[model samples]
Target: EMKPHPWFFGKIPRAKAEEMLSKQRHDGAFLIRESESAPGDFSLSVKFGNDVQHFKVLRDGAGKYFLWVVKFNSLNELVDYHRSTSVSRNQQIFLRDIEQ
Candidate 1:
Protein backbone atom coordinates (compact mmCIF):
# COMPACT_ATOMS: atom_id res chain seq x y z
CA GLU A 1 0.00 0.00 0.00
CA MET A 2 1.10 3.56 -0.64
CA LYS A 3 2.27 5.39 2.43
CA PRO A 4 -0.16 7.90 3.85
CA HIS A 5 1.07 11.47 3.63
CA PRO A 6 -0.63 14.79 4.14
CA TRP A 7 1.37 16.43 1.37
CA PHE A 8 0.13 14.04 -1.27
CA PHE A 9 -2.66 15.73 -3.25
CA GLY A 10 -3.32 12.94 -5.74
CA LYS A 11 -4.55 13.68 -9.26
CA ILE A 12 -4.62 17.46 -8.94
CA PRO A 13 -4.03 19.44 -12.12
CA ARG A 14 -0.96 21.56 -12.63
CA ALA A 15 -2.93 24.79 -12.53
CA LYS A 16 -4.68 23.81 -9.34
CA ALA A 17 -1.43 22.75 -7.75
CA GLU A 18 0.09 26.09 -8.65
CA GLU A 19 -2.91 27.96 -7.30
CA MET A 20 -2.83 26.05 -4.04
CA LEU A 21 0.87 26.56 -3.47
CA SER A 22 0.73 30.17 -4.53
CA LYS A 23 -2.17 30.76 -2.19
CA GLN A 24 0.01 29.59 0.67
CA ARG A 25 2.48 32.37 -0.33
CA HIS A 26 5.25 30.65 1.52
CA ASP A 27 8.57 29.80 -0.02
CA GLY A 28 9.31 26.07 0.30
CA ALA A 29 5.64 25.21 0.45
CA PHE A 30 4.98 22.14 -1.69
CA LEU A 31 2.52 19.41 -2.68
CA ILE A 32 2.66 16.09 -4.48
CA ARG A 33 0.26 15.50 -7.33
CA GLU A 34 -0.24 12.71 -9.81
CA SER A 35 1.25 13.52 -13.18
CA GLU A 36 -1.43 14.50 -15.70
CA SER A 37 0.74 13.86 -18.74
CA ALA A 38 2.53 10.79 -17.49
CA PRO A 39 0.42 8.07 -16.06
CA GLY A 40 1.78 6.30 -12.97
CA ASP A 41 4.16 9.15 -12.29
CA PHE A 42 3.96 12.05 -9.85
CA SER A 43 4.87 15.71 -9.74
CA LEU A 44 6.27 17.90 -7.03
CA SER A 45 5.03 21.49 -7.10
CA VAL A 46 6.80 23.95 -4.88
CA LYS A 47 6.32 27.64 -4.13
CA PHE A 48 9.48 29.69 -4.36
CA GLY A 49 9.94 33.45 -4.35
CA ASN A 50 6.58 34.35 -5.87
CA ASP A 51 6.83 31.55 -8.42
CA VAL A 52 6.12 27.85 -8.54
CA GLN A 53 8.47 25.14 -9.74
CA HIS A 54 7.66 21.58 -10.72
CA PHE A 55 9.73 18.44 -10.61
CA LYS A 56 8.79 15.10 -12.03
CA VAL A 57 8.95 12.05 -9.78
CA LEU A 58 9.82 9.00 -11.82
CA ARG A 59 9.95 5.34 -10.96
CA ASP A 60 12.07 2.58 -12.32
CA GLY A 61 11.32 -1.08 -12.89
CA ALA A 62 12.83 -1.74 -9.49
CA GLY A 63 10.12 0.46 -7.98
CA LYS A 64 12.56 3.01 -6.68
CA TYR A 65 11.55 6.66 -6.79
CA PHE A 66 13.86 9.40 -7.97
CA LEU A 67 13.73 13.05 -8.99
CA TRP A 68 17.45 13.53 -9.47
CA VAL A 69 20.47 11.38 -8.87
CA VAL A 70 19.48 9.92 -5.55
CA LYS A 71 16.84 7.23 -5.41
CA PHE A 72 14.32 6.54 -2.66
CA ASN A 73 12.52 3.38 -1.62
CA SER A 74 9.17 5.11 -1.38
CA LEU A 75 7.43 8.41 -2.08
CA ASN A 76 7.17 9.19 1.61
CA GLU A 77 10.85 8.51 2.05
CA LEU A 78 11.69 10.86 -0.78
CA VAL A 79 9.52 13.61 0.64
CA ASP A 80 10.90 13.21 4.12
CA TYR A 81 14.47 13.32 2.85
CA HIS A 82 13.89 16.52 0.91
CA ARG A 83 12.07 18.21 3.76
CA SER A 84 15.28 18.97 5.60
CA THR A 85 17.42 18.96 2.48
CA SER A 86 17.48 21.42 -0.36
CA VAL A 87 16.09 20.16 -3.63
CA SER A 88 18.49 22.38 -5.51
CA ARG A 89 22.08 23.00 -4.58
CA ASN A 90 22.26 26.56 -5.87
CA GLN A 91 18.85 27.53 -4.56
CA GLN A 92 17.22 27.58 -1.13
CA ILE A 93 14.29 25.54 -2.37
CA PHE A 94 13.25 22.88 0.16
CA LEU A 95 10.07 21.13 1.14
CA ARG A 96 9.18 23.24 4.16
CA ASP A 97 5.40 22.94 4.28
CA ILE A 98 2.63 20.89 2.74
CA GLU A 99 -0.37 22.26 0.78
CA GLN A 100 -2.72 19.80 2.45
Candidate 2:
Protein backbone atom coordinates (compact mmCIF):
# COMPACT_ATOMS: atom_id res chain seq x y z
CA GLU A 1 0.00 0.00 0.00
CA MET A 2 1.26 3.48 -0.88
CA LYS A 3 0.75 6.16 1.71
CA PRO A 4 0.29 9.66 0.38
CA HIS A 5 2.37 12.18 2.24
CA PRO A 6 0.64 14.93 4.21
CA TRP A 7 -2.66 13.12 3.60
CA PHE A 8 -1.57 9.74 4.92
CA PHE A 9 2.01 10.32 6.00
CA GLY A 10 4.31 13.31 6.50
CA LYS A 11 7.80 13.99 5.25
CA ILE A 12 9.97 13.90 8.30
CA PRO A 13 13.68 14.42 8.81
CA ARG A 14 15.98 11.60 7.82
CA ALA A 15 17.46 11.61 11.28
CA LYS A 16 14.02 11.22 12.81
CA ALA A 17 13.31 7.93 11.07
CA GLU A 18 14.60 5.77 13.87
CA GLU A 19 12.89 7.82 16.51
CA MET A 20 9.63 7.79 14.58
CA LEU A 21 9.71 4.03 14.09
CA SER A 22 10.33 3.50 17.79
CA LYS A 23 7.33 5.67 18.53
CA GLN A 24 4.98 4.11 15.95
CA ARG A 25 2.65 2.56 18.53
CA HIS A 26 2.47 5.81 20.45
CA ASP A 27 1.06 8.21 17.83
CA GLY A 28 -1.23 10.80 19.35
CA ALA A 29 -4.17 11.00 16.89
CA PHE A 30 -5.55 9.96 13.46
CA LEU A 31 -8.44 10.23 10.95
CA ILE A 32 -10.09 8.36 8.03
CA ARG A 33 -10.87 8.84 4.34
CA GLU A 34 -13.98 7.57 2.53
CA SER A 35 -13.08 5.58 -0.57
CA GLU A 36 -14.55 6.93 -3.78
CA SER A 37 -14.42 3.42 -5.19
CA ALA A 38 -17.17 2.22 -2.88
CA PRO A 39 -20.30 3.93 -1.76
CA GLY A 40 -19.83 2.40 1.67
CA ASP A 41 -16.08 2.58 1.86
CA PHE A 42 -16.06 3.78 5.42
CA SER A 43 -12.83 2.50 6.78
CA LEU A 44 -11.27 4.58 9.51
CA SER A 45 -7.67 5.70 9.14
CA VAL A 46 -5.03 4.53 11.55
CA LYS A 47 -1.88 6.33 12.71
CA PHE A 48 0.46 7.22 15.52
CA GLY A 49 0.43 10.98 15.10
CA ASN A 50 -1.37 13.39 12.79
CA ASP A 51 -0.90 10.95 9.85
CA VAL A 52 -3.44 8.39 8.72
CA GLN A 53 -1.65 5.12 9.31
CA HIS A 54 -4.20 2.62 8.04
CA PHE A 55 -7.74 2.06 6.81
CA LYS A 56 -10.15 -0.75 5.82
CA VAL A 57 -11.65 0.09 2.43
CA LEU A 58 -14.00 -2.87 2.21
CA ARG A 59 -16.27 -2.98 5.17
CA ASP A 60 -18.61 -5.83 4.22
CA GLY A 61 -16.50 -8.28 2.28
CA ALA A 62 -13.36 -8.88 0.19
CA GLY A 63 -13.89 -6.18 -2.43
CA LYS A 64 -11.67 -3.60 -0.83
CA TYR A 65 -8.64 -1.40 -1.41
CA PHE A 66 -7.03 0.96 1.04
CA LEU A 67 -3.68 2.38 2.15
CA TRP A 68 -1.72 2.03 5.32
CA VAL A 69 0.81 4.59 6.50
CA VAL A 70 3.62 3.40 8.68
CA LYS A 71 6.39 5.62 10.07
CA PHE A 72 9.86 4.19 9.96
CA ASN A 73 12.98 5.88 11.10
CA SER A 74 14.54 3.72 8.35
CA LEU A 75 14.29 4.96 4.75
CA ASN A 76 13.94 1.35 3.63
CA GLU A 77 10.71 1.10 5.54
CA LEU A 78 9.24 3.96 3.55
CA VAL A 79 9.65 2.47 0.09
CA ASP A 80 5.86 2.16 -0.16
CA TYR A 81 5.20 5.78 0.62
CA HIS A 82 3.63 7.21 -2.54
CA ARG A 83 3.41 10.90 -1.69
CA SER A 84 5.41 13.29 0.50
CA THR A 85 4.95 16.50 2.32
CA SER A 86 5.53 19.71 0.38
CA VAL A 87 7.37 21.17 3.33
CA SER A 88 11.05 20.39 3.65
CA ARG A 89 10.65 19.25 7.20
CA ASN A 90 7.46 17.72 8.62
CA GLN A 91 3.97 19.01 7.98
CA GLN A 92 0.46 18.46 9.31
CA ILE A 93 -1.39 15.18 8.50
CA PHE A 94 -5.09 15.44 8.09
CA LEU A 95 -7.96 13.07 7.21
CA ARG A 96 -10.85 15.50 6.88
CA ASP A 97 -9.26 17.17 3.88
CA ILE A 98 -8.11 13.95 2.19
CA GLU A 99 -11.65 12.87 1.34
CA GLN A 100 -12.28 16.20 -0.28
The candidate scoring highest on lDDT is 1
Candidate 1 lDDT over residue span 16-52, tens digit each? 9998888886688888999989988899998887888
Question: Candidate 1 at 86: error in angstroms?
Answer: 1.1
lDDT of 1: 0.85
Query: What local distance difference test score does each model get?
Result: 0.85, 0.35
Give residue 49's error in model 1 in angstroms.
Answer: 1.2
Model 1 TM: 0.87
| lDDT, candidate 2, 9-92, per-residue tens | 333332233344334453323333344445544433433353434444332233323234334442222322323421112444
User: lDDT (0-100) at residue 71 of candidate 2?
Assistant: 41
Score candidate 2 by lDDT. Answer: 0.35
Show model 2 residue runs off by greater than 4 Å: 1-28, 49-51, 57-100
